[PDB]
Every structure is written in C-alpha cells, then in structure tokens.
DNA sequence: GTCCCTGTTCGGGCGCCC
DNA sequence: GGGGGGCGCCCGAACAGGGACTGT
C-alpha cells in the first residue's frame, strides 16, 4: 500500500520548470514489463493518468533485478534533477559488518516495493509526467516516490527514519540497521521472544504502510546483508570476481581496482599502486592500456591473495580495539584490525601519495590518522597501534619536524620492512667538511641557466643548463656539491624552496632530480645545509653568485 | 516577538558536512539534543533543508557534564553585520559561560532553516537525525547582538554597584575583570551568577600577559656560520624595524670561508651588533588596530614545549607577538599543546581588541581535524587555515 | 606586475549497497 | 544499453598563495 506518512515539501530551482523530453523508444519486453507494472501501480493510486493539461514528460525504461524475474521500473529525471532544489543527505556512511556486536538473535527484512510505498508531495507530481508507449500510448504522473529522482534517497532514508523512531524509543534495546529499506534486526532475547518482537515491528511498519515479505525475510544463518554474509560468530565477504582480459582498457583497469579496494577490507594484503599508475594521462574509459611488468606481477599477487579463504569477526566493546600497520613499499600500506590476535575485525590498506616530497615517517602518519577516523565511525572510538617504527625514530622525527604532529597511543612491532629516517641533516655545521656555497640563476625568456657551487677550499664549478627554472636551478647546484664532496659536507645556500624540501627529509619525491639528491643524502656520513640571504653581498655567496648570473642574468 | 535577521546579500546559508564523532560526544549530543527538544528549543527537520552545520560534544574540565558546540563559523561569516581597554588591565578576568540565556528569545523564523545541523550515529546504523534552532542558537554571532538589549538591563543593577567592576560579553562569553583580591573577586562573581540566576573556563589575570621581543645571540667566539645566521636573521628584522643595520657584521663574511672558521668582531661591527641589539627593544611603528580588518595569526613549533606567535593585520606590523610554553616532557602531544596554544591567544584577542583571529596553523590539515575537538574548551571556534611554514622564520622568533 | 611550484577542492570515471 | 543517493578509490583541471625575478 502507500504510507499515510506525511510529504516532504520540494520544489524547483528559481525561475525554472518541469521537464519536456521526448519518451525514447523501447523493446517490445520492456514495454510489456512497464505496462504489467503501470497497469498495477495505477490500480494503486501510486500513478495517475494525466491529460493534455500537462506539458511536461521524462524518459522512462526498466531493468531486470537481481531476482532476475521482476523488472524495475526507472525513470531518467536527469532534467528534472538539474532543475529540483538542493537536499542535504542524510546517508552519512555505509554501516560495517565488523562493526556489529554479537547478537543473540537476528533477522534481516527488506521492504517491498519501498519508494512506491512513500508519497510525493502533490504541488510537485505534475513534473514526474512520464509516457508509456504501446492500442495507442498511455500518459502518467507519479503519486509515489520515483526511482531515478534526486529527491527519493534522501527522503525515503527521512522518512524510514520518522517511521522507525517511536518503535526505537520503545524499544531501545532491539538494535535495527536501517540501510535504505533493509532492515538488520538484532537482539538479545531468546529466539522466541525475538520472533514476537520481530512481528510487532512488521505490524509497525505495516502500520505506516510498509509490507515485509516473507520472501525477503530471513530467519537463519547465515544472513545475507550489505554484500556479506553474517554467519553467528564471523562474517564474509560475498565472493570476489576479478576480470582476466588479455588487453585492458582504463575502463576494465578501473574495474579492476574497484573490485580490489572492495576487497581489501577482509583481504590483508592487497596492493593497486602498480595498477592505478597506468590510469595516469590516458584521456578516455575506451583506451587500452598494456600491463606494465609490475602492474602484470601486482595483479598476479593479488590473484593469489584473493584465492584463500578469509573472514572477519564483530565487536565486543568489553575489549579494546587494536591496528596493526604493515610498510608494502612504494608509499602501500595495509592494517589489520582486531581485538583478538589474528582474529581480525577488518582490514583495509593506505596508499595516498600527498606531497611532491615526501617520506615514510609522514606517510604512516597519514595512516594513523585515516585509520583513527575510519574506527571513531565504525566503532566510535580510537584503536591503540602496533606501528613498524621504533620509538627513537618516531622521537627523532618529531623532536625536528617544524610541524605539530602526533599519534595516538602505541606500541613497536618488529615486523619489517620497519619504517626509518633515511639520513639526517646535522644541526651544527662539520668541522673537517669541506664548504660548499651553491647557487643558480636562470633566464625566463631563453629558459636558458646556470648552477654551480665555489668551495673554502678554492674549486669551483659551474654546469650549464637548456629548458630550466630557478628553482630547478637551486636544485641542481645543491646535487652537484653534493656529487663533488666528500663523506661530510657542509652547503650553503639561499633558496628557501631548496631549503625547505631538504630539510623535510625526503626519500621519495615525484621529482627525478630531488631522487637523484636524495640517493646523495642517503650516501653521506654528515651534511649540514645552511641559508643566506641572496644578493645581500654575503660572500662566498657573493662569488657563486657572480658566477652563475654571467650570461644569465 | 522575534527580530527579523537576513543573510548578508547575495550570500547562501552553510553547507558544511559533519563529520565523525566519538561515542562519547554522540550519546551527550542526542541527550542533550532530544531534551532540547522537548522544551521547544530545537525542531527535527527533514533533508529539503538544504543547508548544514557541523556539531559536536566538549566534557568541560573534570565535569560529567557535556555542552553542545555548533561549529557555526560559516553561517556567522554569511549573517548580516565601543570596546573596554580597561580590561586587559585587571588583575583578575573570570570567564561566565552565559549561554543558556540565548534560548529565552525566540529566532526569526524565516532564519530558522539556516541554523540546520545532523546528529550521526556510530557505524551508519541510521541516516544522520537532522535538527533545527527556534531559540537563538549559541555559537552564532546574532545571538549575542539580538540579545544585547536585555543583556543590558539584567547587569546594569550590578554594575551600578558595582562601577569598578567591567563586565564585557563575546558570544556565549561573559568576561568579568576586578582589581580584587582573588577572594573577594570570587565572591563578586558568585555575587553576579546568583544575580543571573534571577533572570533566567577560571581564571584570567592580564596584567600578567608577556609580550616576546626579538633577540640576538650572546657569544664570546663567532663563527662563520654564527655571523651568516645572525646577518640573516637581522635581514629579516629589517623589515619589522627599519633601524636594523647589517654592513658591518656583513664585512666580516667577506670572501669565502669554512663554517667553522672563528671570526673575531672587528669595533664597527661589535658596536652596530649592540645598537641592533637595542633597536630589537622598542616600539614597532605605526601599528594601528583596524576593526574592519581580520587578526591575523602566526604560529611557530620551537620544540620542547615551546610555541611562539605573532598577531598582525599587516606583514611586519605585529600588534603583539608572544609566547606558550608548556610540559617538556614525554607524553607531549603537539596537536593538544597547539589547540591549547590557539585558544590562548583567541582568549588575548577577545580581551585586547574583542575579536577573533584568523589563524595559520602549522600542522597538517588532516592532522589537525582528525584531533582537534578532543582538546577543545571553548564555546567559540576562531576561522583557520593550514600552513607548512617556512623554518626560516621559526628561526627568526626562536628564544 | 610574471612565472614557478605546491597544495586544495572538486568533478569525473570505476567499486560496493539499496 | 540509458536513472538516483550514499561511502570508498584514483586521477587531473581549476584554483589559491607565496617566493624570485626586472631594470636602456
Ligand atoms: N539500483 C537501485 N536503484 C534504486 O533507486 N533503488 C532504490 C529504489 S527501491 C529501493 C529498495 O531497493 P529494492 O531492490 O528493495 O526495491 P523494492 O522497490 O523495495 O523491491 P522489492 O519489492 O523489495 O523486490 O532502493 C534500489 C536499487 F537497487
Ligand atoms: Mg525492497
């Protein structure tokens, strides 16, 4: 039937109107699939016929569920949707398998028919005109929520809400996940009374005019819900299909990944850099791209890993919740969350590159802090950490970052590859180092420059640069002292920007040249890197100067 | 009887998302929330309001009490739009939390939809709870203004009686300053909250706020470096104070030296390095307070605790510039030392010039958001925004 | 002023759910 | 085959904002 719920209240964007869009034309098994549908739904009062006193009409056509005998009924509203006013959503997240406590009993229920079941408000059912063609065609507007409308989520999960919460008040203690229609119903009584109290809250929402098939009701194990499966002590993942093309277009390659990510929140281990690297330039879906040899090799590991059998358990809050960071190399991680070891709740891997310069302190960093908040919404509370690094080296880092950064509560692991600083500015200038003043200059015009250094020891050096910047410059001449210079050294420079980057700390870096500099740092016993003000006639920063600028500047 | 307010023009409410909240702060907001609404002062809504604002939960000092927090900085930016020099001056400022007030007046209903927020729930087991303001809202900007009348007539009593006594309002805030002892002040502001009682964050002392001068090394031995670094950091100054002089000490660099060559000071340069020492120790010039402009904010890690700040409307023009020092010890926490460190200083801004910075924080976007309301103690919330600032000038105000 | 470099946001694909 | 909202993931196109540069 149709819920004596109250309509919401929508109207079109200023100065606009209903759409006018010619029905496009369909096959002969949809048309019959809408007309069974429409012939239904009009006995209903969910459609009505409309005349000529209506401009308006919207594309309709149908889709075969996933029962695969029943049609669903859509309606391209594209237009409609440009021209309806903002809502704010009220679907904030998706709810989490591991994220549920045990239950005693439980149910699942779905609603039948649930958008149809919900009223559109009056003023607005004008614009919903649609066009059954055929005996000639038949021309209807909506009395119910439609599917392919803007509006229908929201107000659909608003109005679930409305019709659950005086059965909520009453009942505190039934938990209910409410995800569109789906309803997981879980409770501590024994199966009988759980049974009662099911059939109260299916007489609830018959009550507002909301049917629960026996169909879709399901009473034993193992539930299916969400895309699992919640069997009485663990939960799974419904099974994983990987394509397995031989060429492959950035429209499979994005499916492919999609899958994978879907995967990794049960599957430890699994790793995409290699593969959404290809994704990079390529202008179309259509465009085929070759596996590179290591997007080949990742693929193939990952295959491997999906292969075992895997699940995950739910959350007793009597206990604390404890993550567990793996390093995968190429700025890939991958945690395990758990409260029992190797009784994992779930899973999931970090892998965004943030930054051109970057390093392994600051991306586990980025770890915590995501997986901090991925917990406080799936189980409303930080976790305590087992991290690979060790306590000197988190100390280290951040007792010289010139940032506020911190991290919750944890402990070492030695699982490796640990994470580590790979080499370290002096804070005092080397006595026996040789000094190094770099400099660069470049010409905007002919992009034409200069880097080059002049030492206390007397050499000098400058290398001649085609297609180039100042900054590029800098960067250039900080590298090649540190070419020329032994174990130890000490430069001085005045770019703040080469400064800057160096002092971080760096082990990876979008950049070719600052790799190049920093397999130097890495190799050097002690460097020290110093700033001057430029063009202050600070010598010996005044010489390299002079040097770098002739025929440049 | 309600005041008509309206958005600035050509200017749309907010539309902010909320963001997670602990299981904690979620139970107290939907108590607090679903008593508020049984007394009229919030209305569910649906989501054909368009507009959002984010809102939390802060446990007040050692307290089992919860206070709601709406983050109503966008909707204030978009609302429609003398000061008492002397209490930056009293020996004692007790802060009165005097919001509570606001929900006795009624709120325009034709601004009602703007002051939407949601509450969530832990793992997604319901769409987010929407809400809406019938009373002025705490936390928006036209609360205190609407309320302004009536705030007069309820202190006016207890100022006439009290002449000595000044009493400021900011928001949800009431500072009240005294040259008391702190006995008989106390007494005073247990006197005004009875006298509040009536009508339907402990404790400040101004008088004892540092302003942090600029500062030159001492040393018996210069080095290269020692010299380079000092030239450098006086450059910088050159710009805050015009006196600053650098030709001499600059001599000495002349050539081209190891580090740690020692560099014995010649006169001139011993001398212009003491006058520069001086010209560090005065007023800067021509920094006038300008209302219509926003404060500015600067914030630098100096380590171990320590954390510089500097508080300008314009480049090298600072109004004042201090410092925060805190536990040099093992269970620091940066984040919890640098929301610590901003509420500090939006707390000197209120008092000295009664406005709110902007500030330029120098931590991570994603650092700062994922803790910062776990540390929070304010009924307000100043604008911000994220900054890797340059270690040059965490060099420069180092102590 | 201009150019360079870096960081943010936001929109567009795909995954998953109904 | 064509629709919607949510969250996730990646990417790149706009921007914003600060430092360095020019100059008969
Ligand atoms: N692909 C979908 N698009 C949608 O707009 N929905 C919306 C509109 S109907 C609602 C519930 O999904 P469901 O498969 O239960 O559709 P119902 O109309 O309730 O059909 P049933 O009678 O439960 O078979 O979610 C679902 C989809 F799978
Ligand atoms: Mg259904």
Same mark, same amino acid.
């Given at each position: 039937?149709?819920?004596?719920?109250?309509?919401?209240?929508?109207?079109?964007?200023?100065?606009?109107?209903?759409?006018?869009?010619?029905?496009?034309?369909?096959?002969?098994?949809?048309?019959?699939?809408?007309?069974?549908?429409?012939?239904?739904?009009?006995?209903?009062?969910?459609?009505?016929?409309?005349?000529?006193?209506?401009? &308006?009409?919207?594309?309709?056509?149908?889709?075969?569920?996933?029962?695969?005998?029943?049609?669903?009924?859509?309606?391209?509203?594209?237009?409609?949707?440009?021209?309806?006013?903002?809502?704010?959503?009220?679907?904030?997240?998706?709810?989490?398998?591991?994220?549920?406590?045990?239950?005693?009993?439980?149910?699942?229920?779905?609603?039948?028919?649930? &958008?149809?079941?919900?009223?559109?408000?009056?003023?607005?059912?004008?614009?919903?005109?649609?066009?059954?063609?055929?005996?000639?065609?038949?021309?209807?507007? &909506?009395?119910?929520?439609?599917?392919?409308?803007?509006?229908? +989520?929201?107000?659909?999960?608003?109005?679930?809400?409305?019709?659950?919460?005086?059965?909520?008040?009453?009942?505190?203690?039934?938990?209910?996940?409410?995800?569109?229609?789906?309803?997981?119903?879980?409770?501590?009584?024994?199966?009988?009374?759980?049974?009662?109290?099911?059939?109260?809250?299916?007489?609830? /929402?018959?009550?507002?005019?909301?049917?629960?098939?026996?169909?879709?009701?399901?009473?034993?194990?193992?539930?299916?819900?969400?895309?699992?499966?919640?069997?009485?002590?663990?939960?799974?993942?419904?099974?994983?299909?990987?394509?397995?093309?031989?060429?492959?277009?950035?429209?499979?390659?994005?499916?492919?990944?999609?899958?994978?990510?879907?995967?990794?929140?049960?599957?430890?281990?699994?790793?995409?850099?290699?593969?959404?690297?290809?994704?990079?330039?390529?202008?179309?879906?259509?465009?085929?791209?070759? *596996?590179?040899?290591?997007?080949?090799?990742?693929?193939?590991?990952?295959?491997?890993?999906?292969?075992?059998?895997?699940?995950?358990?739910?959350?007793?809050?009597?206990?604390?919740?404890?993550?567990?960071?793996?390093?995968?190399?190429?700025?890939?991680?991958?945690?395990?969350?758990?409260?029992?070891?190797?009784?994992?709740?779930?899973?999931?891997?970090?892998?965004?590159?943030?930054?051109?310069? !970057?390093?392994?302190?600051?991306?586990?960093?980025?770890?915590?802090?995501?997986?901090?908040?991925?917990?406080?919404?799936?189980?409303?509370?930080?976790?305590?950490?087992? /991290?690979?690094?060790?306590?000197?080296?988190?100390?280290?880092?951040?007792?010289?970052?010139?940032?506020?950064?911190?991290?919750?509560?944890?402990?070492?692991?030695? !699982? +490796?590859?640990?994470?580590? *600083?790979?080499?370290?500015?002096?804070?005092?200038?080397?006595?026996?180092?040789?000094?190094? &003043?770099?400099?660069?200059?470049?010409?905007?015009?002919?992009?034409?420059?200069?880097?080059?250094?002049? !030492?206390?020891?007397?050499?000098?050096?400058?290398?001649?640069?085609?297609?180039?910047?100042?900054?590029?410059?800098?960067?250039?001449?900080?590298?090649?002292?540190?070419?020329?210079?032994?174990?130890?050294?000490?430069?001085?420079?005045?770019?703040?920007?080469?400064?800057?980057?160096?002092?971080?700390? +760096?082990?990876?870096?979008?950049?070719? *040249?600052?790799?190049?500099?920093?397999?130097?740092?890495?190799?050097?016993?002690?460097?020290?890197?110093?700033?001057? +003000?430029?063009?202050?006639?600070?010598?010996?920063?005044?010489?390299?100067?002079?040097?770098?600028?002739?025929?440049?500047? | 009887?309600?005041?008509?307010?309206?958005?600035?023009?050509?200017?749309?409410?907010?539309?902010?998302?909320?963001?997670?909240?602990?299981?904690?702060?979620?139970?107290?907001?939907?108590?607090?929330?679903?008593?508020?609404?049984?007394?009229?002062?919030?209305?569910?809504?649906?989501?054909?309001?368009?507009?959002?604002?984010?809102?939390?939960?802060?446990?007040?000092? @050692?307290?089992?009490?919860?206070?709601?927090?709406?983050?109503?900085?966008?909707?204030?930016?978009?609302?429609? @739009?003398?000061?008492?020099?002397?209490?930056?001056?009293?020996?004692?400022?007790?802060?009165?939390?005097?919001? @509570?007030?606001?929900?006795?007046?009624?709120?325009?209903?034709?601004?009602?939809?703007?002051?939407?927020?949601?509450?969530?729930?832990?793992?997604?087991?319901?769409?987010?709870?929407?809400?809406?303001?019938?009373? =002025?809202?705490?936390?928006?900007?036209?609360?205190?203004?609407?309320?302004?009348?009536?705030?007069? #007539?309820?202190?006016?009593?207890?100022?006439?009686?009290?002449?000595?006594?000044?009493?400021?309002?900011?928001? @949800?805030?009431?500072?009240?300053?005294?040259?008391?002892?702190?006995?008989?002040?106390?007494?005073?502001?247990?006197? =005004?909250?009875?006298?509040?009682?009536?009508?339907?964050?402990?404790?400040?002392?101004?008088?004892?706020?540092?302003?942090?001068?600029?500062?030159?090394?001492?040393?018996?031995?210069?080095?290269?470096?020692?010299?380079?670094?000092?030239?450098?950091?006086?450059?910088?100054?050159?710009?805050?104070?015009?006196?600053?002089?650098?030709?001499?000490?600059? %001599?000495?660099?002349?050539?081209?030296?190891?580090?740690?060559?020692?560099?014995?000071?010649?006169?001139?340069?011993?001398?212009?390095?003491?006058?520069?020492?001086?010209?560090? #120790?005065?007023?800067?010039?021509?920094?006038?307070?300008?209302?219509?402009?926003? =404060?500015?904010?600067?914030?630098?890690?100096?380590?171990?605790?320590?954390?510089?700040?500097?508080?300008?409307?314009?480049?090298?023009?600072?109004?004042?510039?201090?410092?925060?020092?805190?536990?040099?010890?093992?269970?620091?926490?940066?984040?919890?030392?640098?929301?610590?460190?901003?509420?500090?200083?939006?707390?000197?801004?209120?008092?000295?010039?009664?406005?709110?910075? %902007?500030?330029?924080?120098?931590?991570?976007?994603?650092?700062?958001?994922?803790?910062?309301?776990?540390?929070?103690?304010?009924?307000?919330?100043?604008?911000?925004?994220?900054?890797?600032?340059?270690?040059?000038?965490?060099?420069?105000?180092?102590?």
């Amino acid at each position: 039937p149709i819920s004596p719920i109250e309509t919401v209240p929508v109207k079109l964007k200023p100065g606009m109107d209903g759409p006018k869009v010619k029905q496009w034309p369909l096959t002969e098994e949809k048309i019959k699939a809408l007309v069974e549908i429409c012939t239904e739904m009009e006995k209903e009062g969910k459609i009505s016929k409309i005349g000529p006193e209506n401009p &308006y009409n919207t594309p309709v056509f149908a889709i075969k569920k996933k029962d695969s005998t029943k049609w669903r009924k859509l309606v391209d509203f594209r237009e409609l949707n440009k021209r309806t006013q903002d809502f704010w959503e009220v679907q904030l997240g998706i709810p989490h398998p591991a994220g549920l406590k045990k239950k005693k009993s439980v149910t699942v229920l779905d609603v039948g028919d649930a &958008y149809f079941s919900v009223p559109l408000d009056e003023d607005f059912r004008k614009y919903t005109a649609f066009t059954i063609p055929s005996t000639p065609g038949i021309r209807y507007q &909506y009395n119910v929520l439609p599917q392919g409308w803007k509006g229908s +989520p929201a107000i659909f999960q608003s109005s679930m809400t409305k019709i659950l919460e005086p059965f909520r008040k009453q009942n505190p203690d039934i938990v209910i996940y409410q995800y569109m229609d789906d309803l997981y119903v879980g409770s501590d009584l024994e199966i009988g009374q759980h049974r009662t109290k099911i059939e109260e809250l299916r007489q609830h /929402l018959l009550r507002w005019g909301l049917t629960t098939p026996d169909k879709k009701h399901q009473k034993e194990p193992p539930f299916l819900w969400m895309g699992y499966e919640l069997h009485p002590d663990k939960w799974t993942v419904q099974p994983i299909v990987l394509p397995e093309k031989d060429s492959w277009t950035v429209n499979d390659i994005c499916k492919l990944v999609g899958k994978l990510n879907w995967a990794s929140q049960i599957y430890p281990g699994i790793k995409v850099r290699q593969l959404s690297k290809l994704l990079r330039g390529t202008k179309a879906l259509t465009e085929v791209i070759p *596996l590179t040899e290591e997007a080949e090799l990742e693929l193939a590991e990952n295959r491997e890993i999906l292969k075992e059998p895997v699940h995950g358990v739910y959350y007793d809050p009597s206990k604390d919740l404890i993550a567990e960071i793996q390093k995968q190399g190429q700025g890939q991680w991958t945690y395990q969350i758990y409260q029992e070891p190797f009784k994992n709740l779930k899973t999931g891997k970090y892998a965004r590159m943030r930054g051109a310069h !970057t390093n392994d302190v600051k991306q586990l960093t980025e770890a915590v802090q995501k997986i901090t908040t991925e917990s406080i919404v799936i189980w409303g509370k930080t976790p305590k950490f087992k /991290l690979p690094i060790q306590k000197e080296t988190w100390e280290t880092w951040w007792t010289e970052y010139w940032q506020a950064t911190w991290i919750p509560e944890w402990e070492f692991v030695n !699982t +490796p590859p640990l994470v580590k *600083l790979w080499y370290q500015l002096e804070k005092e200038p080397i006595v026996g180092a040789e000094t190094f &003043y770099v400099d660069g200059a470049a010409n905007r015009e002919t992009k034409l420059g200069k880097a080059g250094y002049v !030492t206390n020891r007397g050499r000098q050096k400058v290398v001649t640069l085609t297609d180039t910047t100042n900054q590029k410059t800098e960067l250039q001449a900080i590298y090649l002292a540190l070419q020329d210079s032994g174990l130890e050294v000490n430069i001085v420079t005045d770019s703040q920007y080469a400064l800057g980057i160096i002092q971080a700390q +760096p082990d990876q870096s979008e950049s070719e *040249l600052v790799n190049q500099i920093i397999e130097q740092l890495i190799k050097k016993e002690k460097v020290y890197l110093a700033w001057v +003000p430029a063009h202050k006639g600070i010598g010996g920063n005044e010489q390299v100067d002079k040097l770098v600028s002739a025929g440049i500047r | 009887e309600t005041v008509p307010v309206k958005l600035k023009p050509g200017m749309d409410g907010p539309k902010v998302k909320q963001w997670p909240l602990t299981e904690e702060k979620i139970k107290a907001l939907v108590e607090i929330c679903t008593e508020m609404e049984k007394e009229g002062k919030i209305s569910k809504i649906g989501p054909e309001n368009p507009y959002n604002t984010p809102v939390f939960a802060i446990k007040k000092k @050692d307290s089992t009490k919860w206070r709601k927090l709406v983050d109503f900085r966008e909707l204030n930016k978009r609302t429609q @739009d003398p000061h008492p020099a002397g209490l930056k001056k009293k020996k004692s400022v007790t802060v009165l939390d005097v919001g @509570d007030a606001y929900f006795s007046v009624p709120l325009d209903e034709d601004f009602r939809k703007y002051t939407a927020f949601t509450i969530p729930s832990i793992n997604n087991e319901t769409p987010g709870i929407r809400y809406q303001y019938n009373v =002025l809202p705490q936390g928006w900007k036209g609360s205190p203004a609407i309320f302004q009348s009536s705030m007069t #007539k309820i202190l006016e009593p207890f100022r006439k009686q009290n002449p000595d006594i000044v009493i400021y309002q900011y928001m @949800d805030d009431l500072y009240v300053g005294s040259d008391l002892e702190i006995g008989q002040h106390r007494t005073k502001i247990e006197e =005004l909250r009875q006298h509040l009682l009536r009508w339907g964050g402990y404790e400040l002392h101004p008088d004892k706020w540092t302003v942090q001068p600029i500062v030159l090394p001492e040393k018996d031995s210069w080095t290269v470096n020692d010299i380079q670094k000092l030239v450098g950091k006086l450059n910088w100054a050159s710009q805050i104070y015009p006196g600053i002089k650098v030709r001499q000490l600059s %001599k000495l660099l002349r050539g081209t030296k190891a580090l740690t060559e020692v560099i014995p000071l010649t006169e001139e340069a011993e001398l212009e390095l003491a006058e520069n020492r001086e010209i560090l #120790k005065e007023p800067v010039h021509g920094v006038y307070y300008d209302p219509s402009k926003d =404060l500015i904010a600067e914030i630098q890690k100096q380590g171990q605790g320590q954390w510089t700040y500097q508080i300008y409307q314009e480049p090298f023009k600072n109004l004042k510039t201090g410092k925060y020092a805190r536990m040099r010890g093992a269970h620091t926490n940066d984040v919890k030392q640098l929301t610590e460190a901003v509420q500090k200083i939006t707390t000197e801004s209120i008092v000295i010039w009664g406005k709110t910075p %902007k500030f330029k924080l120098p931590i991570q976007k994603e650092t700062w958001e994922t803790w910062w309301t776990e540390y929070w103690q304010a009924t307000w919330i100043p604008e911000w925004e994220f900054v890797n600032t340059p270690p040059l000038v965490k060099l420069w105000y180092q102590l």
